[PDB]
């Protein structure tokens, strides 16, 4: 299956993560203006990744 990598920093140390992806899929997540956590509703003036 498909693999890509990304780094995050933890205790100022780079940690590489390998992400394995079984099939093409999409997900959404809140970026700003989202108080409705739990709902799946994007309110007016929210920003969704």
């Amino acid at each position: 299956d498909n693999v890509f990598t990304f780094n995050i920093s933890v205790n100022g140390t780079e940690v590489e993560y390998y992400a394995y992806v079984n099939k093409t899929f999409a997900f959404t997540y809140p970026v700003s203006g989202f108080p409705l956590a739990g709902s799946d509703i994007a309110p007016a003036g929210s920003v969704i990744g």
């Binding site: 409705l36 956590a37 739990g38 709902s39």
Partner: protein, 49 residues
């Protein structure tokens, strides 16, 4: 009788696993005559078919 308000529905938001109440407002239609609403004489049915 006329429906003379919005119909409001209450649930265990945001989890939406459980249903609490419905509220709505009624009034005699077009102001023409009075309506007996005694719970012995009147029925209210509810169906989610």
């Amino acid at each position: 009788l006329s429906l003379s308000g919005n119909v409001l529905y209450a649930v265990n938001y945001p989890t939406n696993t459980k249903s609490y109440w419905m509220y709505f407002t009624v009034s005699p239609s077009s102001g023409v005559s009075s309506v007996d609403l005694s719970p012995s004489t009147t029925a209210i049915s509810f169906t989610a078919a």
